[PDB]
Amino acid sequence: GAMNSSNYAELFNNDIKLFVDDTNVYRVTVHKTFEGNVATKAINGCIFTLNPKTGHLFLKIIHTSVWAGQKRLSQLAKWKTAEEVSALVRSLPKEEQPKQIIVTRKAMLDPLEVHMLDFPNIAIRPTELRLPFSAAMSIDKLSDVVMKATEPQMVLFNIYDDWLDRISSYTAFSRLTLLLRALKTNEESAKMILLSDPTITIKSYHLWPSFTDEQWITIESQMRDLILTEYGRKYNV
């Protein structure tokens, strides 16, 4: 059943699993027409499919051409997500196929279940966790490849860079969720914290800066502070 606080360690066991977040699949700008009506203009989107144990990210870029002449796009976006996740599973060797897929939004359950009928042994699960994967488009290199795409494209990343050389999956996931929670709550402040010391760079093959173990503790502290401040402001508490 549902993935929650209680069964959290299951994410880092040796059963292959993927999180699927569909938040950034259908993206629009809302604008005024000449006649003063409102219209949307779609921009490129992405499916965020993540192995939380390994950090392997299957970023399926959703080009605006997939919406051309389609109706009820927010509904279609869930089915297109389920179609591409199913295609990804069929593309993987049997021993790499996930045993579970966890969807970050309950509206993905039926679309994914119907697309995965050929895989009755793959469990499709919701989660009670409020995961910040919507903020994936605040990671500059992921935003850059989505916006530059001129056609449908799958791009493979490791969202943990080389962290697993030094820390466990549990700790790497906690660092990722904290970074993304900060980026979601106050993007400008979070990005300022990450780049404030120009001597710490992002490797060409990495997403995040090359912090030492001690620098990560300072960074992680600065992100927690950012999150609590913003919370007091949101709620006047």
């Binding site: 279609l76 089915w79 389920a82 039926d110 679309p111 279940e113 119907v114 697309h115 009928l117 050929d118």
Partner: protein
């Protein structure tokens, strides 16, 4: 006009015949039911006064043989049996009639209720859903599970309703996932009507039978089947006009007949709200929507 005689009534029991019911006292000189209309299936059903659990009964058609009821003190129930000796049977019935120890099937001439509930129900189809091929009549009770309920445990005592599952390879064509899930017309029209049922009459027959088993025995699996067959039509954008008009009449009489006090357990809120207010066919069930809104506005 046909007769189902009773050998005796040794235990106190509420006896149902179709939509009618009679209380019989322990050892009351009751010898059966006469004037049963030819041309329809019928159900004769029982609820013991000492165990209001296990409603049970027998589907039969008097054109197919001479049937009687006899209490079995070993198995502790009223059993239907066939009398193969025509002259012995005619002689039993004539005696009981002469002694007026039989109740009369109490049909009002104006009243088409039973016809309307059983229009498409045929004994030959009942006998394929309820498998006991040595008898011409079919036993159903409160507790019997469906083939579908069993998949999710005695196969010989199952209700073999047609399995309907909206999230199955049967229901969803590869490459038409979203289309087939949101519009079930291909599952209704190609798989179920053309493929399995062969025609709308057999589909309606099974739907009507599922309802009657839900109502008369409180059979939960039957209720599931009745709702699934309704939902499959209502969730299809493309249904023949004759089927929609007929479905509206079928459902109207089922909702009209349902005991007012059993709406809570026999009616699925989600299915009815979806069918009357959200589905493709939300505007195609005028009679059904009017009786549901006037009789069960709480559920909606």
């Amino acid at each position: 006009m046909n007769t189902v005689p009773f050998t005796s009534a040794p235990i106190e029991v509420t006896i149902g015949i179709d939509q009618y019911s009679f209380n019989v006292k322990e050892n009351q000189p009751f010898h059966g039911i006469k004037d049963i209309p030819i041309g329809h299936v019928h159900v004769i059903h029982f609820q013991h006064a000492d165990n209001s659990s296990m409603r049970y009964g027998y589907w039969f058609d008097c054109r197919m043989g001479n049937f009687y009821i006899q209490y079995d003190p070993k198995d502790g129930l009223y059993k239907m049996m066939e009398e193969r000796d025509g002259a012995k049977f005619e002689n039993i019935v004539h005696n009981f009639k002469e002694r007026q120890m039989m109740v009369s099937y109490p049909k009002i001439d104006e009243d088409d209720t039973w016809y309307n509930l059983t229009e498409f129900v045929q004994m030959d189809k009942i006998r394929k859903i309820v498998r006991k091929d040595e008898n011409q009549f079919s036993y159903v009770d409160s507790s019997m599970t469906t083939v579908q309920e069993n998949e999710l445990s005695d196969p010989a005592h199952s209700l073999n309703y047609t399995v309907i599952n909206f999230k199955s390879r049967e229901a969803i064509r590869p490459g038409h996932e979203m289309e087939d899930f949101l519009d079930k017309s291909y599952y209704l029209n190609t798989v179920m009507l053309q493929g399995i049922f062969k025609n709308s009459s057999n589909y309606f027959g099974e739907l009507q039978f599922a309802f009657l088993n839900a109502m008369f025995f409180g059979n939960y699996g039957s209720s599931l089947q009745w709702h699934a067959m309704i939902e499959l039509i209502c969730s299809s954008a493309t249904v023949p006009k004759h089927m929609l008009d007929k479905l509206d009449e079928i459902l109207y009489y089922q909702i009209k007949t349902l005991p007012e006090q059993y709406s809570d357990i026999l009616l699925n809120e989600r299915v009815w709200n979806i069918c009357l207010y959200s589905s493709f066919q939300k505007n195609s069930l005028h009679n059904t929507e009017k009786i549901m809104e006037n009789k069960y506005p709480e559920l909606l």
